[PDB]
């Protein structure tokens, strides 16, 4: 099916952002594991797998619309401490949230309602699983202190 | 069965207090969950379900006695921090305890012994599950400090 | 995540309407049970539990958006006979339907597409489970008469 | 254990009333069955078995207190039509309710709290199973007419 | 296998009548469901599935005989009330019965005995499942009145 | 619930197109089976059943909105060879895709968001199951030739 | 039971044709197996077993009618290549189809309706299993070429 | 469905013959049992149950056609010895065979093809189960003598 | 919860009496076992475990009410023969019965209805399990003589 | 453990090549799926998962050695036809094979034998699963032609 | 098989170091258990069992090569506090790592490749299980403080 | 993959030695069985199967490297008595051990690390299963005498 060149281009933009998020979680999860925080490792490993499904859904949708997917992830910027890692992930999902919202309006505008629903599904994940869980972790650090928090994540 | 208009009126008073307690636990449990304290979420969610059964028992008993149940919850006053939430719940159960004790005497006085037994059952719950668990949590905060306490509730 | 103060305010409006619907079904179901109509009791009891999930979803969504949920149910207006109860429930769902439709447009306007999808899910329930089942019951009364209808609900 | 001669005498009074209720349900249930109303047969047969347990509990309690149980049932007065049978059963449980309430006060007065709790248990049954179910059946007849009601009890 | 052009033409006539019956049951069953008569919904839904198998058998038989099936259903004429729907279905099966009988004679005449047996199988269904069940429902309405009948179909 | 006469009219238009698609798949699947291509038979038989669910959902939705469903399928135009059949099905789904997109905009415009979501669900099916599978089959023919392709579908 | 000498004679004619078909499939299936076409072997082996049941049914029916079955198969004429084998089998079933049709008319004429039903059952098999499957195989050869076809039958 | 008065009349004739056959087998089977021939008892008991199904099918078919079934069995004529019983049963099935054949022609003539198929089913039973089994038993007596035969039936 | 200093003091009095009863049963059961009366051993061992639960319930209730439990058992006075042991246990439960009755009145007077219900539960045990079983054993000795009685308890 | 800065740097080089291979297989597998070659999709999807484990092992090993992993994949160069895709994958694994061989010598030289064994494990995979399977597919195309090959991969 | 006297001598050196590590873990694990740190006990107990397998593999390999194993463990130097114990274990594994690396080069030099592979297996364990887990524990102490760390190991 | 002509040539040399070892064990095992030593038969039969896997791994590896495997086994030299057979097998594995060691160095030299790992795996088998088991058997003969040894192998 030949999709709208603007829609395809912006799915591609979203795709390189999802490939990035996948890779940022890949490195963060393994950093968490190396440091001995199994619970952060398991959660970031899970988010890595979800980002991989978000990427997959965009990639297949671009192929269906007869586009050529852009496979280079955006640049990632990993933290070097637990608080910087959480903050770097929160900044990434904030950016992804804003990109998706704009894609959603753009799909409405070109009357690509199926691409729009794909983006809306991913936006719910970004807001309600990923972004909310991150704010939650920063919230715990704020409430019990970093040391107590990190103990709880072993 | 036509019940004593005073008994029915005071069951109704208890009913609007139980509807309130249900709703106060509803909001507190979900606040606890939003902040990442799954264990407080599970316990307040459980107390919400119990308050719903306390309300149900009063409502059905008022209908059996051919009264018209009052379905407006009393005003609730949720906390904004973990210690204020626990304190607001403790103040609510203290009020409920005192209301029940007076209802129990009033049922004895109008010779409604079945309504009395319903209130006595709920009073045991209020004292021995709900009030005692709350004093217990404040007691833990007092003994290990708020940060350690909150860590234990993740 | 900081949501749009107008969106949060209107979710709050919807929330106090869902708390109300929950409570209206609570009293109607138990009235049906007291009168011996087990089948109306079971159905209204079920709708009460669904309204409780509708309320829960709004409440959590308001908390995620960093709003303060309004926990006072709207005023309810229960019937005193089977036909008035059904009519009072139909008028409630008609009002809820119209409120949701307006919320849906408002979320689109502030580009809160995830809140919008939450409201759309609840609107489908309101129209296709709840409103349609009520019109259905009035339709049966109209077709076989109230006495035959009530017999069938024992 | 030697019980208070007044308490024993009044348990005995309650006992001959429970033996009566047992026998009134015995005849009503079998009349219902003979006429083809299996559902009234099953319910009255069940109430007959419950009255037999109420009688048993009083009888054993009188023996424990070193009294001599009075085994003659009170006179019973069965109906000859479905509405008269329901009304005769409702009048019986109303009388039993009032007798129990007075026994409960009398046990409190002689400080026989265990006999009192036995009577309170039976009073809850009389009010909430038996009396409420009967008012319920008359209520159904009133709402759908006797013919529709009787059809539903086949 | 090259079938007789007259046989193929008349199978085609039967086929467009079966496609019609399928569609008339499709709409009637869903109308019954919308009105709350689950038992009429289930029965008409079942007849819809059977008409679909009758259509399928004719279609495949026409293809085997190297004909081109006519896929346009005949015009259908749904009722707007329960009695008109039953009557419209009875008139349809009466027409189908007569068409089949004539097809059966026509197959005998062109010595297509396998097409004949297919039509005879469907005729038994039309007479003994479908037509007989419809006369039966009208018969019940006639015997107990429409209101009682409709109550029994909830 | 009284729906917007324009929305109902256009659901009806979509309904007669879905009834058509159902029937076009009905004939194509059985043609495939007659020729010995079991795998095309199974896939078209499956699409026939899905079109039947698409039709069902529109029909019920029109009834809920108090419309009168139009039950005449649009005209269908079956192929006479495997490549023409695939092309005729692709042209049908292209038309259905465009009709749905316009219905989706029309529902948004009359603020019928539940009808809109029904159409969006079906559009995803049309694009991602049905249209994509057809382009896929033509793509295989183009890549390996018609003879090799048809061999693979036995 | 003494059957009509003409009916018995013609059952006997059909019997020697079924014995023949059995034997033609016997040799074809084993030729297919020798050449490595397991799928043609399995299908012809199956048809051989079915012809054996067709023969059995005629033989027993002739014995019941107090006839003497003729046990010499007609002459068979096996192919020497896959296309000639399929064509030789198609010519055999065409002959059997015509013989059965005439037997069916002859049984009707002597009022032997049970022999007639036996022949009708076998005619349905000849047309709808056997003849249709053969035309189908020739159809596949015509559509994908002999080499591709034979590959698919390994 | 209003059937042809001649068809109904002749189904009725067949029905009184099947009721008779049922009763003749009833008495023969129990005579066989009384004499100690369990195997003849079991077989005649089985034929009695089959005749009861033949009767049932005619009776229901006459009711469907809006006839009044004739429920008086024809006169029966039981044997007094094993060979006379077998012969009396063989004469009965011979008569039934001839009656059915004529009914079958009569149904064809009034174009009642479903009644015809019912009669054809029963004719196959009469010829191939019942008549053939009886000739078989007489055949065994002829081949091994009556004494050996009767020994084998204990 | 701060309980009434008088209620707490008297729970404490009851507690030291229950600790005593536990210990009196402890020694009696093991004396019974040493002498070879397994059945008296098992019953007194069971009563020891029940007294331990009675003690536990008082102790926890005193702690909940912010009292300091008194953990010294009252003085016990074990028998030296089977009849003196039974009599010493009967005198203990008589004393416990009277203490509980007075506690029950005292709780009513300070409006501690939950402590009251705890005492009422234990009073039922004291009267209906423990006291009644003891009178029962003395009753058996009186009826069959001590030797026969003791034989039955091996 | 502080690893040799040269070893870490070259693991990092290998890591960005494995991230690339993962992504090249990601796009190729989904391209294969879009075109209808399920078997190529499943195999490339599998190789994608294996490359992800190769990447994971390098990443964790770099972290253990206190290096900072480089998370940017090398540039990838996907094919646009089945033969170009296979060739692009073969060229990638040839490059990976040569890079690994050099890493293996480099680890030997810095006496990092555990990193060396990690690289040797991956080299066996690259040669014996991945490279050998690709040469194999090109070999099949060469032997049976591209069309036959692609048919076999549906 | 007669091994190289230098290889055997150095396996022996490694063996007395593994016997030592086994014994150092033996004492540390039991010290951890005595202090109440079950999780450190379980982990050190596990490492003790692994060191025992490392020792076993060296011992058997020396015997196979016709050497005489040296069974005296090296001197061990246990800590007296949790941080000194972890540090003493880390210093031991650092020494073992360096000894193994040199043994690996020495086996390569005498062309004993099987002894070399044994040492490489143990080196991977020393680096990736044992050394990495120890650095990990010190890392946790550094991140959350010793008290929080020790709490987590109870 | 094109391997180094020297590596391929020497794998080929190893291959003809493994084919030989397979065949030497083949004859020895069956000689052992013929003489009644089931335990030597089972062990040599097992070594024959292992040599067959060693051969297989070399053969496949040579094919992967685009070499032509040499399939002629080296000359074998079986014993004629149990001690000569064991000695002939020990001399064979000694030769294989030395050949492998040289192949391992040669693979290192041409940077074929995967062939090297294949040879190292087989060398461990040759030394630790095969050579060690043989020395072991000679050792037993030396310790208990040949007669006792052979008895133990029945
Ligand atoms: Fe995402
Ligand atoms: Fe996310
Ligand atoms: Fe998530
Ligand atoms: Fe409560
Ligand atoms: Fe509570
Ligand atoms: Fe509780
Ligand atoms: Fe709702
Ligand atoms: Fe609702
Ligand atoms: Fe619902
Ligand atoms: Fe009672
Ligand atoms: Fe009662
Ligand atoms: Fe009850
Ligand atoms: Fe039909
Ligand atoms: Fe029909
Ligand atoms: Fe049917
Ligand atoms: Fe569709
Ligand atoms: Fe579709
Ligand atoms: Fe689909
Ligand atoms: Fe045949
Ligand atoms: Fe055939
Ligand atoms: Fe067949
Ligand atoms: Fe019969
Ligand atoms: Fe018969
Ligand atoms: Fe039979
Ligand atoms: Fe006690
Ligand atoms: Fe006690
Ligand atoms: Fe007890
Ligand atoms: Fe790789
Ligand atoms: Fe690879
Ligand atoms: Fe692989
Ligand atoms: Fe070690
Ligand atoms: Fe270690
Ligand atoms: Fe380890
Ligand atoms: Fe080997
Ligand atoms: Fe070996
Ligand atoms: Fe081995
Ligand atoms: Na802590
Ligand atoms: Na009725
Ligand atoms: Na092919």
From Swiss-Prot, chains A, B, C, D, E, F, G, H, I, J, K, L:
Q: Give the residues the record marks as binding Fe(3+) C.
A: 46, 50
What are the alphabetically sorted keywords of the record?
A: Cytoplasm, Ion transport, Iron, Iron storage, Iron transport, Metal-binding, Oxidoreductase, Transport
- Induction, per UniProt: Transcription is up-regulated by FeCl(3) and H(2)O(2).
The UniProt record lists the Ferritin-like diiron domain at 1-145
Binding locations of Fe(3+) E = 50, 129
Can you say where in the cell this protein is located?
Cytoplasm
> When this gene is knocked out, what is seen?
Produces about half the wild-type levels of catalase A in strain PAO1 (katA), slight increase in sensitivity to H(2)O(2), a double katA-ftnA deletion is more sensitive to H(2)O(2). When grown in iron-limiting conditions is less sensitive to H(2)O(2). BFR complexes are composed only of BfrB.
Q: Enumerate the transmembrane spans.
A: none
GO cellular component terms? Answer: cytosol
Q: What is its main location?
A: cytoplasm
* Keyword Cytoplasm found: yes
Which parts of the chain are coiled coil?
A: none
Listed binding positions for Fe(3+) A are 18, 51, 54
Other comments on record:
Binds up to 5 iron ions per subunit depending on the protein state; aside from Fe(3+)A and in some structures Fe(3+)B, the other sites are approximately half-occupied. The unstable catalytic dinuclear iron-binding site within each subunit (probably Fe(3+)A and Fe(3+)B) is known as the ferroxidase center; it is labile.
Q: How is the quaternary structure described?
A: The bacterioferritin (BFR) complex is formed of 24 subunits (FtnA and BfrB) arranged as 12 homodimers. The holocomplex contains about 8.7% Fe and 8.0% phosphate. In vivo purifies with BfrB in varying ratios, depending on the O(2) content; as O(2) decreases FtnA content rises. Pure FtnA BFR complexes are not isolated in situ, although in a bfrB deletion some iron will accumulate in FtnA ferritin complexes.
This chain's protein is named Bacterial ferritin
